[PDB]
Every structure is written in C-alpha cells, then in structure tokens.
Write an enzyme that holds these catalytic residues in place. Structure first.
Site, mmCIF file in Angstrom:
data_model
loop_
_atom_site.group_PDB
_atom_site.id
_atom_site.type_symbol
_atom_site.label_atom_id
_atom_site.label_comp_id
_atom_site.label_asym_id
_atom_site.label_seq_id
_atom_site.Cartn_x
_atom_site.Cartn_y
_atom_site.Cartn_z
ATOM 1 N N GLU A 15 71.233 3.892 31.492
ATOM 2 C CA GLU A 15 71.941 4.609 32.540
ATOM 3 C C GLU A 15 72.017 3.689 33.767
ATOM 4 O O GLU A 15 71.000 3.138 34.200
ATOM 5 C CB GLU A 15 71.212 5.907 32.889
ATOM 6 N N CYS A 62 70.870 11.949 38.515
ATOM 7 C CA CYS A 62 71.003 11.445 37.137
ATOM 8 C C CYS A 62 71.383 12.590 36.214
ATOM 9 O O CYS A 62 70.765 13.649 36.219
ATOM 10 C CB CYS A 62 69.683 10.862 36.689
ATOM 11 N N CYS A 65 68.795 12.045 32.574
ATOM 12 C CA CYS A 65 67.647 12.892 32.859
ATOM 13 C C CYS A 65 68.095 14.088 33.738
ATOM 14 O O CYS A 65 67.513 14.394 34.773
ATOM 15 C CB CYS A 65 66.470 12.129 33.405
ATOM 16 N N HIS A 69 65.422 16.393 38.074
ATOM 17 C CA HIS A 69 65.375 16.351 39.520
ATOM 18 C C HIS A 69 65.552 17.725 40.149
ATOM 19 O O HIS A 69 65.006 17.991 41.227
ATOM 20 C CB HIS A 69 66.415 15.374 40.068
ATOM 21 N N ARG A 460 61.191 9.391 31.429
ATOM 22 C CA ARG A 460 60.891 8.019 31.812
ATOM 23 C C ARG A 460 59.616 7.882 32.654
ATOM 24 O O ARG A 460 59.254 6.757 33.014
ATOM 25 C CB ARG A 460 62.099 7.377 32.495
ATOM 26 N N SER A 483 61.931 5.170 37.050
ATOM 27 C CA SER A 483 62.516 3.847 36.936
ATOM 28 C C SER A 483 62.323 3.027 38.218
ATOM 29 O O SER A 483 62.395 1.802 38.166
ATOM 30 C CB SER A 483 63.977 3.894 36.575
ATOM 31 N N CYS A 527 66.852 3.725 34.000
ATOM 32 C CA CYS A 527 67.780 4.682 34.566
ATOM 33 C C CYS A 527 67.975 4.300 36.017
ATOM 34 O O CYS A 527 67.110 4.542 36.870
ATOM 35 C CB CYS A 527 67.259 6.093 34.367
ATOM 36 N N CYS A 530 68.741 6.956 38.737
ATOM 37 C CA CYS A 530 67.402 7.453 39.057
ATOM 38 C C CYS A 530 66.644 6.504 39.973
ATOM 39 O O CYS A 530 66.090 6.919 40.996
ATOM 40 C CB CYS A 530 66.570 7.638 37.777
#
Ligand code: SF4
Ligand code: SF4
Ligand code: F3S
Ligand SMILES: [Mg+2]
Lengths: 533, 265
Positions: A15, A62, A65, A69, A460, A483, A527, A530
């Site tokens: 991503e 994101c 994912c 969030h 992640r 990330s 990501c 992210c």
C-alpha cells in the site's frame, strides 16, 4: 557480482508510495534507506474539529487496513471521555477486527507477496496430475488434475493473448536465478492466488455484516456501536458462515501453501532479521486494561525473549531529524508536531515523509512477528501450539523466526490463531445476548479538556492514536502507525529503522531484477499511507 | 481471443480504499475483469514489476497504438510545485499531466480523484485537487465516480457502458453518471417513513435507534447526498443506515468540510 546503487521506486505490491535505495558491494546490500514519498497531513487537517469526527477522517489513513484507524480513534476518544462501552460493543468491534486480520493477511500473502516467490508463467509447463498429487498431499482438501488443468488452460489463453497485464515485465519472466519453485508448485500457488481473489470477497463481506460496508466501515461511535441488527440471529448466522468459509481457506489453502513455499526457500532464514520488537496486544475483555487482551502487549530488546519488558506508553518519541519536517526534535505524541519541510532526497540528510518512532531510543519492529514472538514468550497456548507445529513441519529451530522467512511464517501463524479465536469471541457474544444483554452503546459527555489514547494491534502491528482535547475541540491529534515504526527512517541517533537494518546482508543475484530486496521489504507488509498519514 | 481494452490505473494521494473496493467486484468478479473483460496494464498495488521495470510497463501501456483507458485514484497534490507526492521521483501532478491527455477516456474513481477528498479538507496543506480541477488547463474531462470509496458496481457499470457505446453515459453537473448518482440516498432510504412522521432517534443508545427510527437528528446527510447505497448496498449485504449509522455524505464534493460536524444537522 554487482557493486553500486540500486533504487526501487515504485516499490509495488504494497500500500502506498515507497522508494527503497540500497548500496550493494560484491553482490550484497551494505546500506539501505526507506523513503516514503507521499504526504497528506491528516493530523494538520484534524486540528480544531469535533473529536467525534476524528474516526471518519482517520479511517481514510488507509483502506487496506480499513476499520483499524476508526477503531483506534474511537478507542482514543472513548478513553478521553471516560466511557466504558458495553460488553456487546467490545464483542462486535473485536469480531470486525478479527475479520479484518483474515482478509488483510490472505490478500497480503497471495496478491502482494507471492509474486516475489512464484513464477506464474512457469505454471504453464506444469504437469497438472503431478501438481494435484502435491496439492492433495499438503492439505486435507483434495485437488484433482482437472481442477488444476482448468487454471492452466485459463492462464494459457491469457499468456497467448500477449497482454500480460499485471505480469508485464515481472522479475520472473524468462527465468530468474532467485526463483526456485518447480512448475507444479508454481501452478498450485497460481491456482490458489486466483481462488483467493474470490475468497477475499467473502472475508471482506464478513466485516460488512455488522460494519455496514468494506472498505471503510460505518458502525462505530463514541460509547459503542450503532448496529442493532448485529444482535439478530440472522446477521450473526451470516457472519458465522462467512467466517467459517474464510477459516477453512486459511487452514486448508493459505497455511499449506505458505509452508510449501517456505520449505523451498529455506535459505531465507538467513536474511532479513531484526533486533527489537514492540506489540500492543489485541482483542480486549476490558477496554482500559491492555493485559486483558487475547494477545498481550510487550517490548523485547536484542531478541531477549526471556526478559519481556512492560509497555510504557510514555517511552515513545517520534523523531524528525532524517524526515521532511522542521528541525530535529523528537516528540512524545501527546506533544506531537507535524510541520512539513521538504528538502528533497537526502537534502540535509532527510529522505522520508515518515517520522521515526523510537521506544526508549530504540528502533522497533512491529507486526505479526512481534505479536507472535511476544505472545509465544508469554506462554500463549494457541500461539505456542501453532508456532511449534510450523517449526516442526519446516524442520527448523526457533532461530529461524528472526528472518524474512520467519516474518512471513508469523503472518500465517497469526492468521490461523485469530481465525480460531474469532469463533471463541463469536460464541461469547452469542452467550451474552442469550443472557439478555441487548445493549450496544453507552451515554457519555464531552469534557472541555482531556487527553486520550487508543491502542490497536492492527495487521501490521502496534497502532496508537493520541488526542489532546481543548475547549471541547481537537487541540492535537497524533497518529503513530505500525508502518511508521517499521519503515520510518533513521532517528537523531542515526539508528537504522527495522526495514533498513533488515536489508543489510541481502544478496542480489541480478541488480536489474532485485527480487531479494522485494522479498524482505514485502515481508514487513508496508503501508505507506498508514506510515505517513 | 479478441484484444482486451487496456487500462492504466494510477495512484495519487490516496488511501488505497478505492483500489480495495474494485477487488470487491461481484458478478463480474475481479478475476473475470482482469482475465476476460480488460487488460490491467499498470496498477501499483498488484502488479508484478517494480521500480524501473514498472516504469517501463507504464510507458509501454501509455504509448500503445491500441490506446488505453485511465482509471485514477487519489487527489493530485499541487502545493509547492507538486512535491508532496512523487512516484519514481516525478511529481504526481507531472505524471498525470503527461499521461491523462493521452488516454482515450479517463475515469476519476473515488471522492479524492473526483473532488480532492480527505487531503483537500481544510487547511489543505498539500494543495490537493481533484483530477478535473487540477488538469482543466489540459482539457482533461474525467468521468467522476464519487464515494469514499465508491460502490464498485458503479465503476464496472461505467466501464461496460463505455466499452459498449464508445461514449460516456449521461453525466450530472458534477460529471457523475446519472444512472448511479441521480437520486439522493435519502429518497431511497427505508427509514423515510419515520423521517416523514418526525420520528427521529435522539441518541444511539435510545430505544428509538433500536427500533430503526430516522438518523437525521444524529447527523444523517442522506438528504443532501447523491449515491445508490440503499439500492445496491455494499458487499451484497449492508449499507451505513442499515447498520444504524448516519450517512456522512461521502460522494459529495468537499464533504469533509461541508458535512461536518458529522453528528449534527
Ligand atoms: S476516495 Fe476515500 S477510499 Fe478512495 S482513496 Fe480517497 S480517502 Fe481513500
Ligand atoms: S436515516 Fe438518513 S437517509 Fe434515512 S430517512 Fe433518515 S435522514 Fe433520510
Ligand atoms: S456515507 Fe457514503 S457510502 Fe453511501 S450511505 Fe452515505 S454516500
Ligand atoms: Mg503521526
């Protein structure tokens, strides 16, 4: 053998927007830089807004994912306002998160990672009868020659069109010395790649059953969840059926494939190791106690798993010295600053839009390898059982986990463990409803001044959202994302980040087609939307 | 078989939720789309090639004498000469300026690409713009398929219509297809009889919310939002109001600033 630079920009099959730069000497990487090349500035955008609005903005950090969030922001604001959400809200939030893990990891292994290991074109050379025998030997699901010939026939038509589409200029075209699989194993993996394209539809649908839609769920509020329909037997049965099918795919398709690929690439136990690990825990019983989570938080330095340290949230600081922000001062996220200042690549020794989070000054890997190793070392019985079974099947010792191969295996281990645990959570949720608890949201009041933090262990790794409420508005809002930990740059002590350090020692057989760099980078599941936000 | 039409899929300032929505395609599924319907010739999320090899794949597709369709995800950052977003060390503004005028047709997919989206919300530090706004001086007129992310039904339906008819379908004043965006969410909502009766949930915990009363007092933007959510649903199964949560207006321009606070009307 090659000496000189290699740049990979774009790094595809992640991503977001990543540039990897390495220095190679006599065929091995000697230095690395992780450069994130898009900034959006969501923390800047949030200032002054209603705290209830944060989750809607931050979810758009994101869409890979997705949900994570929204959950972190809602946990953060829940915490700031002091609300204890109802048991059913915890169950529903946890179930949707479990479903997200399964979706995300399945898609990562097949659709992001596997083209680093699988030569799809070599599947055309395969004997489908031999391939079917291999496939049926590794899984309780039986596969026949005709099943795999159907895949091979479809692939043949596609390749003979000359329009290779997503396989155009693949590193494996024409053969590559770092691609090891036989034709039959390539055919099995390719068949399962295609199957996973349809299976992931079901895995994502499971989130929508309670969560409205995927991507970007819409069922969380401060104080709980909104989805009264999620209490119904019909919605629960719909979720359960999708979960069962997804778990069967994990157990019968993904894990066997992961093991058959890992066994062929056992040399990859030698590359891509890291030193330090952080994890936040996930799937709480008590929203205010991280140690009530099915996976527990912890911190490990220098692979010393006999001495897991407690997680102290005050020991996080995010560095900017090697990032495109003003100055050089690291900040704890309750005192965070997001002040962009671009200097171009390596201008003033800065090379990324990610900040560089450090824990007690150290660079920390987070994600499946951290979650699995820490839980194993805490005595988690399910993680121990699956991990030991994987090591035994591969004929390797525990040291093998500290590697690119190990990290890839840990993602599978995590998937298997969570797939089983979703059933336990589902039963607990049913049992709670049966006792007569039909409450899904609790009332709350907005303080004028407050601080809050929300913790999620996402696919992640350790995600935290941090709010300072002033005059009932967002005074400061800071995201510190997995990330960011793993793929952020160097800090003001010049310490390489986990991805940078892990790349040192990577062999590169063909600098024009540097698949070995991709294997390690992809094993962290980057990501970048992210990491930067 | 016949030659399949080439698609070049670009990622600007985006969260990849729009890409993920395309993976949710149903009847046809994504495998059918990329093996049978189309040739997906550049897509950073799933393509095999990386680095120089990926750049070469992009050049090959864009310069093909057979032509291509561009699908664009994400807003274009324009502040500071475009430097907030780069791919292969080129600004996204430069990339899109060079590629999009060469396409046979352009589809801006998602509210970011259509209207600027989340990074364009105040104070818009990166100067993000939707495709048509950023590139108006070049004559680019992308079909806008809005939503955060859109319904993938609406992308596939637009592509199929274009391939069959060699023209865009009828478009509204925001350049969105009227066949998908012609009705408000609200006029299609099952809670409309409660709205008409003045039966509003006063809180999410309330018995009225439990009974499915209208979410307008809790901020629902259905009355001001054009989309086909209640009709098509998402993932063949649900949509926000049926999950008990207000619409946040996500297919509308500037919704991050126009529709907030999300929990007020
Ligand atoms: S429109 Fe929404 S889902 Fe799509 S890229 Fe933008 S923020 Fe992500
Ligand atoms: S819940 Fe929203 S879309 Fe439905 S009737 Fe009420 S205001 Fe309209
Ligand atoms: S928030 Fe978006 S997905 Fe539909 S219900 Fe409202 S337009
Ligand atoms: Mg941050």
């Amino acid at each position: 053998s090659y000496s000189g630079p290699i740049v990979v920009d774009p790094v595809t099959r992640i991503e977001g927007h990543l540039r990897i730069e390495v220095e190679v000497e006599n065929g091995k990487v000697k230095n690395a830089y992780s450069s994130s090349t898009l900034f959006r500035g969501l923390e800047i955008i949030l200032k002054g807004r209603d705290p209830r609005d944060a989750q809607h903005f931050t979810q758009r950090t994101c869409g890979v994912c997705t949900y994570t969030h929204a959950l972190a922001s809602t946990r953060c604001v829940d915490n700031a306002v002091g609300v204890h959400i109802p048991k059913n809200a915890t169950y529903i939030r946890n179930l949707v998160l479990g479903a997200q893990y399964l979706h995300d990891h399945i898609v990562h292994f097949y659709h992001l990672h596997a083209l680093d290991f699988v030569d799809v074109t070599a599947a055309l050379k395969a004997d489908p009868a031999k391939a079917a025998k291999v496939a049926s030997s590794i899984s309780p699901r039986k596969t026949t020659a005709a099943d795999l010939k159907a895949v091979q026939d479809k692939l043949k038509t596609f390749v003979e069109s000359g329009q290779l589409g997503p396989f155009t200029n693949a590193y494996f075209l024409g053969g590559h010395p770092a691609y090891y699989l036989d034709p039959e194993t390539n055919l099995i993996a390719t068949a399962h790649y295609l199957e996973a394209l349809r299976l992931q539809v079901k895995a994502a649908r499971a989130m929508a059953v309670f969560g409205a839609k995927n991507p970007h769920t819409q069922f969380t509020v401060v104080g709980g969840v909104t989805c009264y329909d999620a209490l119904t037997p019909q919605r629960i049965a719909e979720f359960e059926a999708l979960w069962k099918e997804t778990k069967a795919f994990v157990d019968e398709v993904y894990i066997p494939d992961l093991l058959v690929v890992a066994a062929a690439y056992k040399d990859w136990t030698q590359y891509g190791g890291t030193d330090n690990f952080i994890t936040f825990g996930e799937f709480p019983k008590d929203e205010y106690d991280l140690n009530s989570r099915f996976f527990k938080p912890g911190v490990v330095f220098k692979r010393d798993f006999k001495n897991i340290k407690p997680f102290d949230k005050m020991q996080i600081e995010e560095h900017v010295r090697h990032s495109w922000y003003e100055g050089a001062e690291a900040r704890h996220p309750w005192k965070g600053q997001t002040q962009p200042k671009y200097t171009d690549l390596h201008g003033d020794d800065r090379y990324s839009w990610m900040k560089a989070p450090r824990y007690m000054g150290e660079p920390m890997e987070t994600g499946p390898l951290a979650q699995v190793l820490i839980a194993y070392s805490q005595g988690h019985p399910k993680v121990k059982a699956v991990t030991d079974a994987v090591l035994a099947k591969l004929g390797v010792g525990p040291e093998a986990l500290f590697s690119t191969l190990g990290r890839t295996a840990a993602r599978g281990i995590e998937t298997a463990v969570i797939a089983e645990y979703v059933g336990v959570m589902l039963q607990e949720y049913k049992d709670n409803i049966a006792k007569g608890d039909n409450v899904i949201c609790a009332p709350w009041e907005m303080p004028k001044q407050a601080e809050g933090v929300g913790f999620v262990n996402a696919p992640r790794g350790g995600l935290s959202h941090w709010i300072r409420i002033e005059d009932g508005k967002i005074g400061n809002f800071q995201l510190v994302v997995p990330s960011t930990w793993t793929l952020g740059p160097r800090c003001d002590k010049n310490k390489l980040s986990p991805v940078e350090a892990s790349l040192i020692g990577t062999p590169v057989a063909d600098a024009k087609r540097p698949v070995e760099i991709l294997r390690t980078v992809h094993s962290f599941d980057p990501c970048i939307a992210c990491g930067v936000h | 078989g016949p030659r399949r039409p080439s698609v070049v899929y670009l990622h600007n300032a985006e969260c990849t939720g729009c890409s993920e929505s395309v993976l949710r395609a149903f009847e046809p599924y994504i495998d059918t789309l990329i093996l049978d319907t189309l040739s997906l010739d550049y897509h950073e999320t799933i393509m095999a090639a990386a680095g120089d090899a990926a750049e070469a794949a992009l050049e090959q597709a864009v310069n093909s004498p057979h032509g291509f369709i561009a699908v664009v995800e994400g807003g274009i950052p324009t502040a500071a000469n475009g430097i907030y977003g780069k791919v292969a060390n080129h600004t996204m503004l430069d990339i899109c300026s060079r590629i999009l005028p060469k396409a046979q047709a352009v589809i801006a997919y998602g509210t970011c690409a259509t209207f600027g989206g989340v990074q364009a919300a105040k104070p818009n530090p990166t100067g993000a713009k939707g495709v048509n706004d950023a590139l108006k001086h070049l004559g680019v007129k992308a079909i806008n398929i809005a939503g955060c992310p859109p319904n993938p039904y609406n992308l596939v339906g637009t592509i199929v219509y274009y391939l069959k008819n060699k023209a865009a379908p009828e478009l509204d004043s925001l350049n969105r297809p009227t066949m998908f965006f012609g009705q408000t969410v609200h006029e299609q909502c099952p809670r409309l009889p409660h709205f008409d009766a003045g039966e509003f949930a006063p809180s999410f915990e309330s018995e009225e919310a439990r009974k499915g009363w209208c979410l307008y007092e809790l901020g629902c933007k259905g009355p001001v939002t054009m989309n086909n959510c209640p009709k098509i649903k998402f993932n063949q199964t649900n949509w926000p109001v049926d999950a008990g949560h207000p619409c946040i207006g996500c297919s509308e321009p500037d919704f991050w600033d126009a529709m907030t606070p999300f929990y007020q009307n």
